[PDB]
Write a protein that binds this ligand. Structure first.
Ligand SMILES: O=c1ccn([C@@H]2O[C@H](COP(=O)(O)OP(=O)(O)OP(=O)(O)O)[C@@H](O)[C@H]2O)c(=O)[nH]1
Ligand SMILES: O=c1ccn([C@@H]2O[C@H](COP(=O)(O)OP(=O)(O)OP(=O)(O)O)[C@@H](O)[C@H]2O)c(=O)[nH]1
Ligand SMILES: O=c1ccn([C@@H]2O[C@H](COP(=O)(O)OP(=O)(O)OP(=O)(O)O)[C@@H](O)[C@H]2O)c(=O)[nH]1
Ligand SMILES: O=c1ccn([C@@H]2O[C@H](COP(=O)(O)OP(=O)(O)OP(=O)(O)O)[C@@H](O)[C@H]2O)c(=O)[nH]1
Ligand SMILES: O=c1ccn([C@@H]2O[C@H](COP(=O)(O)OP(=O)(O)O)[C@@H](O)[C@H]2O)c(=O)[nH]1
Ligand SMILES: O=c1ccn([C@@H]2O[C@H](COP(=O)(O)OP(=O)(O)O)[C@@H](O)[C@H]2O)c(=O)[nH]1
Ligand SMILES: O=c1ccn([C@@H]2O[C@H](COP(=O)(O)OP(=O)(O)O)[C@@H](O)[C@H]2O)c(=O)[nH]1
Ligand SMILES: O=c1ccn([C@@H]2O[C@H](COP(=O)(O)OP(=O)(O)O)[C@@H](O)[C@H]2O)c(=O)[nH]1
Ligand SMILES: O=c1ccn([C@@H]2O[C@H](COP(=O)(O)OP(=O)(O)O)[C@@H](O)[C@H]2O)c(=O)[nH]1
Ligand SMILES: O=c1ccn([C@@H]2O[C@H](COP(=O)(O)OP(=O)(O)O)[C@@H](O)[C@H]2O)c(=O)[nH]1
Lengths: 159, 229, 229, 229, 229, 159
């Protein structure tokens, strides 16, 4: 019955609604759901994707380098992470965004010990930038994060 | 007559085609123009915008916080910078991308002296992430970067052939910063234009889409609008 | 009532006493004032200026390059920041120094989220190196830092009792940004004032040297000049 | 005959003229001397001091913490390094500035192999921030840098004509490290002199202000004091 | 009576057992001693040596260049630091390793303020790569690090119970720096001892192998040799 | 007949002679051989190991972390690279040492374009620090370097 540590897999559709970009309504309602579950006394780590901006397969079909395409996708994931952080902060929630790409001015570097400390402090963890390396999927990143931070359950958003 | 160091300011429309996202054809033609002007033998620093992804004021009035909105806009600027770098390097042009927000795995940090050296080595110096500070714009980013790298001119690449007396109109040719302020034209943002006028930096608003326009402007042909002093 | 988050702005006079170098007495006075304000329970970010060492415009007038002059001025700001950190640690106040120019061994890189967390934890957050870019100034640095951290007010520390109608003879009390622009008053430079007006950050110009003035201003007493929206 | 690789050592007097701050005339004289030496075909690494701004020992005597005082002094050395770089670029000499404290935007991190390569390529290699560690001094910095890059001589630039037997009255010509230690002469501080003696690096103390003295010393003429093995 | 901040200098013998390489048992017992003294409630910075791998003077007299010899020695120091960190963390002790030679993937860079914060957080601050500069030793590295982090004492961990009047002899108890210089004892290298004496840093030479010796020295029990002033 | 770009795989035995440490005689004679082949008009990239100092299997058997053990091994490889660079410089050869671990004060970061430029300039390339990541072998690093820098032949030293 229930869980204590949940990793929520959010995709670009959860931030775009099908259209390319950012739709404040969908992100606001998913932030409301996360607020409900976190006030229900659960620890939440949300791993965020960037399909609403870019995908490596589509950029390779357009004819760009795989490494550059994956870095652009990770940047899109970080943008979605910032948007979700803002919408969660609008509901009185303390959130910590960790990016696998070291961008200190934007967020904090990925550290599983810091992440589990934040989870134990009640803060909502937001894993962006994927795994920080090319040739990876956000589902693989979600599995790795769940295995590392000891998340007892993984739940994927659906449309 | 002629500019050796140009700072090409490319707004988000130059990557999105007026829409939201990335347009491969517009980026390809911009890359072709940049490659032509590089093979002409010019030192070019390209300041990227992110209006095709996000704007801080727009997101703030939508409801989001200005700081995170600005950081999302700067990340979109970095994405556009990466796209332009890929398209330029698809044509044999050596490009170095520098971001004012330190992201080592993505691009080298902002080193102005190394950027000047890259320019002297015949490389296109792409400037992303703006100035790395919220409550600012890519226009003042372009002004500051052009002033620091000692650029000869700031080439504002727009979809129109130049600035007009009133939005649809007469297309002006050569104006001054004081005249622009008096007439209330639209060359750049308030802070950007204030800095550019205080430091006496020549601006050249021109239509980049017309083939060879950037080459003519660099060679010194009287096209577009020249805001000088 | 009163301001919970203040961004103090200290100029080179607050570290040089009107001369070139460093006067320990003035820095000790500033440290005592900031210490009692912190003991009052206020979140405070200070922004340091380096006019007591170098001004980029003056060095450019002398003949040096503007970019190098600006970097020398920013290094002077970092030096004054370290001096203030020392004098504040003498008073048992925990301080965190952040420099816009990344120098990890000397201080930590500018991280606004870390700065606001340090403000929450009762630490004085000192800002050196300005904004890290040439052609700007510490007034623009103060405005941008206050906007980004979310500071309630910007406290301009001066040696005089606020903004006057005519520099030497009337002492103003409360005005607006538009009123200051119309009357041609001097609060900050053009870029900083434009940014502050566009974002509506309240400014309080007051004499820090007089004992208790900063505490009174934080509590909300009517002292100096209050430039509001 | 003569020295091919020299490590010039400039103190705060060479940038302040005996006062606090920066005197452009003395820096211009130093730049002219270094420029003509480089035009002579010599590899030169300069090491900058910051006594014209701050001394850690004096600040500790005043009451500040020694570590922070030393970091302020190193930042002052970096500022003087930037001033010298500007004045050398005014003379058309290519310079590379390396700071022991990593500040990538201002200069490049201290890389000895890069420094010797820059020396090979005809660039003056300027060293700021000392050795990057507190409690040391620019004399120790000069000794260590000369040992590491492989400089043939260490040229101590002073305002007097070399080392004297008694500070104000005899002017020495050539001595050894042991002779200097026995007679109690002043060339460098204890740590730098100990390191130099243990490694046998030749020292030449001479007046840089007099025109052509550094060129004569590089060619091999007998001027100033030569402390050899 | 008692030291709160200790800088434990561990020579290469403490990792090699007198041989060349790494001895797991000696490192394990050193880690046990450090863990005991940490659980005693002390702030400890451990400066590592690399004599069990290489010495610059030895390689120079063998024929290799001094600079590369010193860099190999510093890399061996970093390897010993990593081994000590692993053995300490095998016992539940939180250790932070800092190297004066920037190697991000191996260890965090040398940040003295962050190291002091780690000490205040009850973490063992390991110092590797010496001071990152050739023509220096881990003894002067230890002296400089202890002076900068404001350590209470420098604990020289040797295989003997203290310094003697002559190598095999009377074991001294409490001496001064001047007395050590006059008697020609062996506490540290020339430069290291000069710096330590000039800055008045207390040294404590003791046998680390004897269980509880470090704990007794920290608590203030009169063991080993205390070089004070 | 002959080659133009040769990748020489050197192991810790080539620097120790069986004993733990550094033996100047073996490294001096291998430097003499490299001098002969480079004056014969060949481009040489030498990938160096660190078995003379440490091995991941031995350190794991002793009971240390795999990541730390591999970093110590890479540091040993860098030390061997510095020794070989010194002994090659003793014979009037320009050598460039590239380490996969970014240690700017010691050497230059690994860049295949810079490496091939140095090879075309006649300088001898010295690949140390392996591939910069744990769980890799120096033979795997040699294969990767040969495939990247376009080395036409790979030759492994033998005892
Ligand atoms: O971190 C850094 C690196 C480099 N720089 C600055 O970059 C400029 C050159 O950056 P380079 O690395 O191009 O030096 P270089 O000109 O010597 O290049 P080569 O001759 O080897 O082709 C130099 O002026 C240096 O100070 C920095 O300011 N910071
Ligand atoms: O490099 C960094 C580190 C941290 N941060 C951001 O700074 C803010 C505070 O980072 P702190 O580490 O100062 O506070 P913390 O609450 O995150 O940890 P505790 O104090 O509870 O131990 C956090 O929101 C973090 O994401 C960065 O932006 N960059
Ligand atoms: O980060 C670095 C880069 C370079 N170096 C070392 O600096 C020395 C010179 O590095 P340079 O790049 O200045 O000279 P180069 O000869 O290596 O390249 P060209 O000038 O031929 O273009 C080389 O020996 C390199 O290994 C470092 O130690 N660290
Ligand atoms: O790059 C850096 C990072 C940190 N520092 C210096 O490290 C010291 C503390 O380093 P911390 O990162 O521990 O700051 P903190 O004390 O706020 O840690 P928490 O409260 O979040 O646990 C601060 O004094 C900072 O200036 C640097 O000097 N440079
Ligand atoms: O560790 C990671 C995380 C993300 N990505 C790239 O990020 C882009 C967008 O992420 P995804 O396609 O996984 O987003 P979703 O489909 O979950 O919205 C893709 O090109 C991925 O290759 C990557 O390469 N490595
Ligand atoms: O230095 C900078 C550059 C960009 N931005 C943010 O990124 C967005 C995109 O920049 P701009 O709007 O200047 O791009 P354009 O529409 O000219 O392409 C801006 O709205 C800001 O919110 C910023 O905050 N600081
Ligand atoms: O972002 C910044 C902030 C400051 N400065 C330099 O800082 C020096 C002194 O700062 P200011 O003139 O703002 O100091 P004040 O007059 O307030 O003492 C000037 O040379 C500026 O160029 C700079 O270059 N960039
Ligand atoms: O490695 C170094 C070199 C210099 N300095 C500081 O630099 C300042 C001025 O340097 P010096 O006293 O060597 O200058 P000079 O007397 O030669 O002008 C002093 O406060 C030193 O502490 C330092 O801390 N570490
Ligand atoms: O700051 C430092 C520390 C170490 N080393 C080199 O590393 C070797 C090992 O250090 P030491 O000889 O001081 O170690 P111990 O024998 O005391 O363990 C020295 O010989 C030097 O060549 C160096 O050059 N500078
Ligand atoms: O890319 C690399 C290169 C080396 N190593 C480690 O380096 C150590 C010594 O290297 P090796 O054992 O490959 O040396 P050799 O047997 O060639 O002398 C081993 O523990 C390897 O795991 C590693 O982990 N990754």
């Amino acid at each position: 019955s229930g869980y204590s540590r949940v990793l929520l897999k959010l995709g670009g559709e959860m931030f775009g609604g099908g259209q390319v970009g950012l739709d404040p309504d969908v992100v606001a309602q998913v932030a409301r759901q996360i607020a409900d579950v976190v006030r229900g006394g659960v620890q939440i780590a949300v791993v965020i994707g960037g399909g609403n901006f870019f995908r490596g397969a589509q950029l390779q079909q357009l004819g760009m380098e795989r490494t550059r395409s994956d870095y652009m996708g990770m940047l899109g994931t970080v943008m979605n992470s910032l948007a979700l952080q803002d919408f969660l902060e609008k509901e009185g929630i303390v959130t910590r965004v960790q990016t696998a790409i070291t961008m200190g001015q934007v967020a904090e570097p990925y550290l599983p010990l810091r992440a589990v400390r934040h989870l134990e402090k009640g803060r909502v963890v937001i894993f962006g930038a994927g795994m920080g390396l090319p040739y990876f999927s956000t589902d693989t990143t979600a599995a790795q994060r769940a295995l590392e931070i000891g998340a007892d359950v993984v739940l994927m958003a659906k449309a």
